[PDB]
Amino acid sequence: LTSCPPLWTGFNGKCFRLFHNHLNFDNAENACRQFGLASCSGDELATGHLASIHSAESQAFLTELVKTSLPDLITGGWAPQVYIGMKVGSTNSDQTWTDGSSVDYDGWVSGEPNNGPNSRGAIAAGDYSRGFWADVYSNNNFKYICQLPCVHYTLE
Amino acid sequence: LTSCPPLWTGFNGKCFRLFHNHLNFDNAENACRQFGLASCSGDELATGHLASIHSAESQAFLTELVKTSLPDLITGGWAPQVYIGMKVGSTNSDQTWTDGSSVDYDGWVSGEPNNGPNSRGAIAAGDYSRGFWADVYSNNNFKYICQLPCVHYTLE
Amino acid sequence: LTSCPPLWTGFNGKCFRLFHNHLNFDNAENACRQFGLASCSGDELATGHLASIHSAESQAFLTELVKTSLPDLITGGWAPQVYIGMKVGSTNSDQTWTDGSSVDYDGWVSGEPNNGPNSRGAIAAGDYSRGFWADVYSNNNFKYICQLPCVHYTLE
Amino acid sequence: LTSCPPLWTGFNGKCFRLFHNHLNFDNAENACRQFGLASCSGDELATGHLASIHSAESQAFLTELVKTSLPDLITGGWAPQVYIGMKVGSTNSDQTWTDGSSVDYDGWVSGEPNNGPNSRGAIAAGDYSRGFWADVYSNNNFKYICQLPCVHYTLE
Numbered sequence: 017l018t019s020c021p022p023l024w025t026g027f028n029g030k031c032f033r034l035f036h037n038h039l040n041f042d043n044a045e046n047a048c049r050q051f052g053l054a055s056c057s058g059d060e061l062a063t064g065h066l067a068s069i070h071s072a073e074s075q076a077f078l079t080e081l082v083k084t085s086l087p088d089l090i091t092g093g094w095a096p097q098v099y100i101g102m103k104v105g106s107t108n109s110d111q112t113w114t115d116g117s118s119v120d121y122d123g124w125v126s127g128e129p130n131n132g133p134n135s136r137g138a139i140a141a142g143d144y145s146r147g148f149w150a151d152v153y154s155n156n157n158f159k160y161i162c163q164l165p166c167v168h169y170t171l172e
Numbered sequence: 173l174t175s176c177p178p179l180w181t182g183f184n185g186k187c188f189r190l191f192h193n194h195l196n197f198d199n200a201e202n203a204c205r206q207f208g209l210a211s212c213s214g215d216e217l218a219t220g221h222l223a224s225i226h227s228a229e230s231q232a233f234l235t236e237l238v239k240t241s242l243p244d245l246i247t248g249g250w251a252p253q254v255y256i257g258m259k260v261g262s263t264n265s266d267q268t269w270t271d272g273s274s275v276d277y278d279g280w281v282s283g284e285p286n287n288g289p290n291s292r293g294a295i296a297a298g299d300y301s302r303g304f305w306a307d308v309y310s311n312n313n314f315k316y317i318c319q320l321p322c323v324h325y326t327l328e
Numbered sequence: 329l330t331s332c333p334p335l336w337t338g339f340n341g342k343c344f345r346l347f348h349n350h351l352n353f354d355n356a357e358n359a360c361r362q363f364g365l366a367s368c369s370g371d372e373l374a375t376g377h378l379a380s381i382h383s384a385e386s387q388a389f390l391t392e393l394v395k396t397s398l399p400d401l402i403t404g405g406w407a408p409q410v411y412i413g414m415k416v417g418s419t420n421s422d423q424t425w426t427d428g429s430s431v432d433y434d435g436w437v438s439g440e441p442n443n444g445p446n447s448r449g450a451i452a453a454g455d456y457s458r459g460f461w462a463d464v465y466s467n468n469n470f471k472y473i474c475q476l477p478c479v480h481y482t483l484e
Numbered sequence: 485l486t487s488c489p490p491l492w493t494g495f496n497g498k499c500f501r502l503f504h505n506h507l508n509f510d511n512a513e514n515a516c517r518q519f520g521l522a523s524c525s526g527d528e529l530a531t532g533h534l535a536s537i538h539s540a541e542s543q544a545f546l547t548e549l550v551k552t553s554l555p556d557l558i559t560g561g562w563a564p565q566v567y568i569g570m571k572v573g574s575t576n577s578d579q580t581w582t583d584g585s586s587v588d589y590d591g592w593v594s595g596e597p598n599n600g601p602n603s604r605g606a607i608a609a610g611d612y613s614r615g616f617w618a619d620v621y622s623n624n625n626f627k628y629i630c631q632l633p634c635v636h637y638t639l640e
């Protein structure tokens with residue numbers, strides 16, 4: 017069990033939340049950056065971010081979260097698409113996460129990404145893609161998932 | 173912080189979840205009883221339950237949970253109505269919770285309950301009632317909120 | 329990461345505490361039974377217990393907890409010996425835990441148990457045994473480790 | 485309930501630990517600074533510290549932690565004294581904590597501080613002082629209490 021604030025839901029030491037208002041990629045990432053981590057004495061230490069995903073288990077959890085929350089929107093295509101923190105740059109091999117973590121799990125639907133350069137990843141929860149990732153235009157207005165600053169203690 | 177399993181959300185030492193399929197009151201309560209608490213050695217110790225509410229703060233939290241999860245269904249009326257564990261019996265003063273806890277908070281919209289005997293409580297999230305409670309027929313098919321067995325350590 | 333009450337320390341979903349006063353096996357188990365688990369509505373659901381151990385990792389954690397708490401008592405022999413919930417009955421193969429969990433990890437020092445029938449398990453933290461288990465007389469007065477009722481949520 | 489790493493014990497959203505080796509004030513703080521907080525992607529965000537205390541309840545908890553851990557050392561005087569992060573500067577009114585939090589709770593034994601300038605705080609657990617603070621030389625070798633970086637999420 018992970019501990020998270022009210023309205024947020026934990027998996028594997030991370031806290032997530034899906035937001036229902038539609039934002040483009042930059043505004044969405046900005047929205048997530050309004051959530052933070054701070055020392056008890058006042059200093060802001062880190063910021064939130066669109067979600068990153070590092071295992072098939074994280075991916076299945078996020079997929080279920082989208083499907084359970086948006087049950088009447090599930091189509092037979094790709095929709096609903098929901099923003100995560102993935103950025104495809106000048107070539108398909110340039111992949112990064114907004115939280116700056118490493119790209120060590122390939123969750124793309126086969127064929128994807130194919131809308132480069134400078135496209136954005138989204139969870140595509142329609143029956144065609146089953147939650148695995150599509151790349152889209154940053155200017156699309158979509159729902160999105162935030163993560164809280166991911167952190168652990170170090171002992172040494 | 174409260175620690176809850178994935179998909180569940182904690183407030184004040186309790187873990188809740190909103191389910192989106194429509195069930196009548198008895199089937200809903202049944203669905204919540206599929207979730208339990210167990211010793212690590214295997215004995216089942218308690219069962220889940222439609223949510224109970226013991227303070228204005230619990231009530232505001234559950235309201236926000238319904239409004240954020242179901243933003244497109246919010247009407248100017250009572251709808252969406254969502255089941256909680258409240259039972260009105262033979263008279264209005266016979267009020268009980270399915271988890272067996274005490275009725276020490278009155279969250280009723282004024283004029284409610286008015287559909288007795290043997291009516292059922294629901295959160296009425298439309299703009300008319302703001303999440304405060306209506307009473308209804310047990311045979312209505314609604315979405316519902318489950319709580320996991322509420323539990324604390326005793327230390328002496 | 330595990331949440332425990334003050335003075336108690338968590339590992340892997342369980343909460344443990346070492347007590348410094350010396351008690352025979354029965355009184356010690358009794359002492360741990362003063363700690364409990366309870367519904368928020370009043371019913372007592374389970375009781376504490378001398379620690380059980382189900383993996384090499386639980387074992388190393390308990391060993392470290394003893395060594396770091398009693399640093400001046402560590403001898404080059406078996407001492408200090410500290411009670412856990414292990415019971416050897418009429419034969420060496422009759423091994424049980426007081427919390428009723430399964431004996432699925434062999435933490436015995438080679439040669440142990442050898443003081444049957446009806447002997448008791450103890451962590452032997454002297455340099456000879458490195459925290460691995462000796463069996464002793466139930467009438468020995470030792471320090472001991474309690475665990476709080478171990479519990480998880482069930483989802484199905 | 486607070487979640488802490490193994491061997492550490494939580495109170496009120498903070499994790500603490502008592503160490504049994506004697507160090508002077510600077511070496512003690514240094515030892516606590518070996519424990520940190522870090523982003524999952526690698527950046528070190530904060531460091532540990534000698535404990536700070538901000539309420540009568542924090543103070544009773546730390547007192548109980550010292551008394552339960554060191555039961556044979558309790559004298560009828562001040563001993564055992566145990567370092568916390570309190571610094572008294574050039575005057576008695578110059579009081580600071582090493583974690584940089586605010587001095588908003590007075591836990592001094594009456595008469596203290598009286599060994600300034602540049603003295604240091606310690607919990608004095610003997611029967612004379614009951615855990616409340618004495619000020620001492622920085623060059624005394626004592627046991628000490630560390631706190632892990634105290635942090636919370638900001639919902640802004």
Ligand SMILES: OC[C@H]1O[C@H](OC[C@H]2O[C@H](O)[C@H](O)[C@@H](O)[C@@H]2O)[C@H](O)[C@@H](O)[C@H]1O
Nearest residue numbers: 093094097127128130131140150151152
């Ligand atoms: O992000 C989803 C998706 O967007 C583009 O969609 C192709 C699909 O949409 C069409 O309108 C048509 O109705 C579908 O049959 C077709 O599969 C894009 O080409 C995909 O790469 C993907 O990004």
Ligand SMILES: OC[C@H]1O[C@H](OC[C@H]2O[C@H](O)[C@H](O)[C@@H](O)[C@@H]2O)[C@H](O)[C@@H](O)[C@H]1O
Nearest residue numbers: 249250253283284286287296306307308
């Ligand atoms: O369950 C909701 C609600 O049902 C009944 O509604 C009275 C209300 O609905 C009318 O159709 C009208 O449009 C509304 O203005 C009026 O408030 C029942 O009377 C309530 O107790 C409550 O159960």
Ligand SMILES: OC[C@H]1O[C@H](OC[C@H]2O[C@H](O)[C@H](O)[C@@H](O)[C@@H]2O)[C@H](O)[C@@H](O)[C@H]1O
Nearest residue numbers: 405406409439440442443452462463464
């Ligand atoms: O409980 C510890 C231990 O007690 C018995 O001790 C055997 C050991 O102690 C002897 O005095 C000798 O000095 C040691 O070298 C020897 O190992 C018992 O035999 C063990 O099974 C165990 O219970």
Ligand SMILES: OC[C@H]1O[C@H](OC[C@H]2O[C@H](O)[C@H](O)[C@@H](O)[C@@H]2O)[C@H](O)[C@@H](O)[C@H]1O
Nearest residue numbers: 561562565595596598599608618619620
């Ligand atoms: O650090 C503890 C304490 O040290 C000084 O002790 C005064 C106390 O010790 C005396 O030897 C005498 O035995 C006690 O009765 C007396 O209380 C100092 O004066 C204190 O401020 C404090 O630092």
Ligand SMILES: [Ca+2]
Nearest residue numbers: 130131151152
């Ligand atoms: Ca695409």
Ligand SMILES: [Ca+2]
Nearest residue numbers: 286287307308
């Ligand atoms: Ca009604």
Ligand SMILES: [Ca+2]
Nearest residue numbers: 442443462463
């Ligand atoms: Ca033996």
Ligand SMILES: [Ca+2]
Nearest residue numbers: 598599618619
């Ligand atoms: Ca002094």
